[PDB]
């Protein structure tokens, strides 16, 4: 009676596991280099080259964040694995406007913009929200009296060559998106800015409510 | 008598107002706030309200067997239909807005089958009670002259 008992037990255990795995979520932390990924992760992990996933333990839902930046290979060949992911936690650093790169004499802001455009332009990522975290705000706020962006950037004909305004870079990133774009959730953070995990849950609830409200056709 | 002319001249105004309201929901059938409320079940309610105003016109005139039999069940069914529509619409939105993880409806059309079948399930209990009642003891007219002599 071996075959029937083994099959029945295996099917029962598999069905129980599938039922128990109903409450789960996946998100990817796709960010550029030197964005403080470890620093950002440590703050939220304290309280509230392999692919490593962090099993967050939020209320009634076990969140899963996967680190994918450290691959150093082709992206389109394995980006098909993540299709059920509901949000992209894209990350940039605001201090790259004057931190020129010469290792190609082009500023890392151009590379970050190109990466953002490539990721957003993907037809596969059509039913997933976009979270645009901006880190290292203190450097941009402080050192601007010696780093005016009138020459380093062509679309900052503002007051003069102080009084930092991050809204210009915000507009530069936002304009790089197609029409009828979904709401882009962007909250500026710092080294010890605690209020980020709750910004994430805010976008997740909103990303789902909008979808179900679309599905039950209530509009 | 003018009292009869009156109740009738109200029950036409109500019909006209209900017709006017259904016309907006048909002309402006794609605005965000119209689609916010269920534009299926909102239509069905309006028809039930039309049925409600009409039931009253079965109390005017000399009573007869069929009129006396149809007087109460029509109004009861119409009112419970309206109540069921309201109840099912309210529960759907609470459910929509009590959503943790996303939807899983397997077929879009059957999806809106639940929206309609629940109302019929609610109305089934009184359609039953009306049917058994009418067959086991139907109402009938009765000329009464005992209470007052003249």
UniProtKB/Swiss-Prot annotation, chain A:
A GO biological process held by the record: glutamate receptor signaling pathway
Binding site for GTP: 35-39, 135-136, 138, 191
Annotated region described as G3 motif, given as residue ranges: 63-72
InterPro entries linked: Gprotein_alpha_Q (IPR000654), Gprotein_alpha_su (IPR001019), GproteinA_insert (IPR011025), P-loop_NTPase (IPR027417)
GO cellular component, one term: Golgi apparatus
Family to which the UniProt record says this protein belongs: Belongs to the G-alpha family. G(q) subfamily.
Protein name: Guanine nucleotide-binding protein G(q) subunit alpha
Gene: GNAQ
UniProtKB/Swiss-Prot annotation, chain B:
Post-translational modification note: Ubiquitinated by RNF19A; which induces proteasomal degradation. N-glycosylated.
Coiled coil: none
Substitution effect: residue 118 to Q: In HYPOC1; increased G-protein coupled receptor signaling pathway; does not affect cell membrane localization
Topological region Extracellular: 60-65
Tissue expression as described in the entry: Expressed in the temporal lobe, frontal lobe, parietal lobe, hippocampus, and cerebellum. Also found in kidney, lung, liver, heart, skeletal muscle, placenta.
Subcellular compartments: Cell membrane
Assembly behavior: Homodimer; disulfide-linked. Interacts with VCP. Interacts with ARRB1.
Pathology linked to this chain's protein: Hypocalciuric hypercalcemia, familial 1: A form of hypocalciuric hypercalcemia, a disorder of mineral homeostasis that is transmitted as an autosomal dominant trait with a high degree of penetrance. It is characterized biochemically by lifelong elevation of serum calcium concentrations and is associated with inappropriately low urinary calcium excretion and a normal or mildly elevated circulating parathyroid hormone level. Hypermagnesemia is typically present. Affected individuals are usually asymptomatic and the disorder is considered benign. Hyperparathyroidism, neonatal severe: A disorder characterized by severe hypercalcemia, bone demineralization, and failure to thrive usually manifesting in the first 6 months of life. If untreated, NSHPT can be a devastating neurodevelopmental disorder, which in some cases is lethal without parathyroidectomy.
Entry's family note: Belongs to the G-protein coupled receptor 3 family.
Notes concerning its domains: The extracellular regions of the homodimer interact in a side-by-side fashion while facing opposite directions. Each extracellular region consists of three domains, LB1 (ligand-binding 1), LB2 and CR (cysteine-rich). The two lobe-shaped domains LB1 and LB2 form a venus flytrap module. In the inactive configuration, the venus flytrap modules of both protomers are in the open conformation associated with the resting state (open-open) and the interdomain cleft is empty. In addition, each protomer contains three anions, which reinforce the inactive conformation, and one calcium ion.
Designated name of the protein: Extracellular calcium-sensing receptor
Whole sequence portion shown: 610 to 759 of 1078
